[PDB]
């Protein structure tokens, strides 16, 4: 039927976000201890790295989202929910997937933070070419501009402070990461349980044959089509797995902020759960990709 619970509730809906920031802060700060700045400028100065990946999600992924719209003949609400997901920048949770993939972790940031600063300038003007007949009003104001900067900077701080630890005393990296492995696993329990308390109950309605089909094949095409254009275009073979996991993976916590404001919530219904469900299959597709390229070593 409906989505009974109301969102933005202090008891549980805030615990999904006020704890996720704590979850992301330490994780990426811990992730920040595997990058050397002295070769970061090498990635930036010669743009052969990000160019294939940045184009792979600002000139290719919107096509994948838009093609699935017209081909599947989805209504102009879900045909726009998956298009907004397509234009979304490189996911802050994608940088995790480069670590397990043995990819070039230094090039992950150069296409995560640099491809999010383009979301400010592309997406507002990337919708006029893709919402010409899917939405009547303008999307200029609906985009959460102040919700990206407070998201990029919250990501940028562990990006730099994560390596700065190697400047004063890295002896205290032992004193930090030895507990980070111990401690951050407690947060994931709080993150996963509370989600099943508030939004997980009404998930059963959200599934739809023409909605799971897009949410299942779109993270997959983003993965594969991001890789072939990466490795085959003369880029390093071992570095290609960094681009592949960045093209397919992209944030969807930014799409939900648009649907809340773009148009009324009774039209949405439990379509609020698509970005939550999209990441589940986005995560699920990768966790099948992790093993396969961990098989090639063995």
């Amino acid at each position, epitope marked *: 039927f409906t989505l009974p619970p109301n969102f933005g509730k202090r008891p549980t809906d805030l615990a999904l976000s006020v704890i996720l920031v704590v979850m992301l802060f330490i994780i990426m700060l811990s992730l920040g201890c595997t990058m050397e700045f002295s070769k970061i400028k090498a990635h930036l100065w010669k743009p052969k790295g990000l160019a294939i990946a940045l184009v792979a999600q600002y000139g290719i992924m919107p096509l994948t989202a838009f093609v699935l719209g017209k081909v599947f003949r989805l209504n*102009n609400i879900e045909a726009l929910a998956i298009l907004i997901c397509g234009c979304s920048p490189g996911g802050n949770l994608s940088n995790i997937f480069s670590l397990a993939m043995k990819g070039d972790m230094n090039l992950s940031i150069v296409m995560t933070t640099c491809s999010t600063f383009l979301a400010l300038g592309m997406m507002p003007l990337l919708l006029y070419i893709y919402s010409r007949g*899917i939405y009547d009003g303008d999307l200029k104001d609906k985009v959460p501009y102040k919700g990206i900067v407070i998201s990029l900077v919250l990501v940028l701080i562990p990006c730099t402070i994560g390596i700065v630890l190697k400047s004063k005393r890295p002896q205290y990296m032992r004193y930090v990461i030895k507990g980070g492995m111990i401690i951050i696993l407690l947060c994931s329990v709080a993150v996963t349980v509370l989600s099943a308390i508030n939004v997980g109950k009404s998930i059963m309605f959200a599934m739809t044959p023409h909605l799971i089909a897009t949410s299942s094949l779109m993270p997959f095409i983003g993965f594969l089509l991001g890789y072939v254009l990466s490795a085959l275009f003369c880029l390093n073979g071992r570095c290609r797995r960094t681009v592949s996991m960045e093209t397919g993976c992209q944030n969807v916590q930014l799409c939900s902020t648009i649907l809340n404001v773009a148009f009324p919530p009774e039209v949405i219904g439990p379509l609020f759960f698509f970005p939550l469900l999209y990441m589940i299959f986005q995560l699920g597709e990768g966790l099948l990709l992790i093993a396969i390229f961990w098989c090639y070593e063995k």
Partner: nanobody
Framework: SLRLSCAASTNLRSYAMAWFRQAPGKEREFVSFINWNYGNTRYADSVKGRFTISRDNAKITVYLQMNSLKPEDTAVYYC???????????????????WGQGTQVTVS
């Protein structure tokens, strides 16, 4: 108690369909709403308990079952459909891109 159907005359994909009512010599007032993919519904103030709007999975018809009709409900009901998404109030008629032929309900 009479139930009235609204069938789309062409194969079109609408994300929500609602019913409106134009009182004799009066502005059209909101009556009922239903989501299309899902079952979200939002009846008007007076009609909260009385009427009931329901779709069918198989066909594309929309129904509005009425019960306990009041003699103030005599008006001309105007089925409405919403094709393209936009920011507009449910109660407001600006959200709906397609309208209906129109039918008149009279009671005593």
């Amino acid at each position: 108690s009479l139930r009235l159907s609204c069938a789309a005359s062409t194969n079109l994909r609408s994300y929500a369909m609602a019913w409106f009512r134009q009182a004799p010599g009066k502005e059209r007032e909101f009556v009922s709403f239903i989501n299309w993919n899902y079952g979200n519904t939002r009846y008007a103030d007076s009609v909260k308990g009385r009427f009931t709007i329901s779709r069918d999975n198989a066909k594309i018809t929309v129904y509005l079952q009425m019960n306990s009709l009041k003699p103030e409900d005599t008006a001309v009901y105007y089925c409405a459909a919403a094709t393209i998404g936009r920011l507009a109030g449910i109660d407001s008629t600006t959200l709906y891109d397609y309208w209906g032929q129109g039918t008149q309900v009279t009671v005593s």
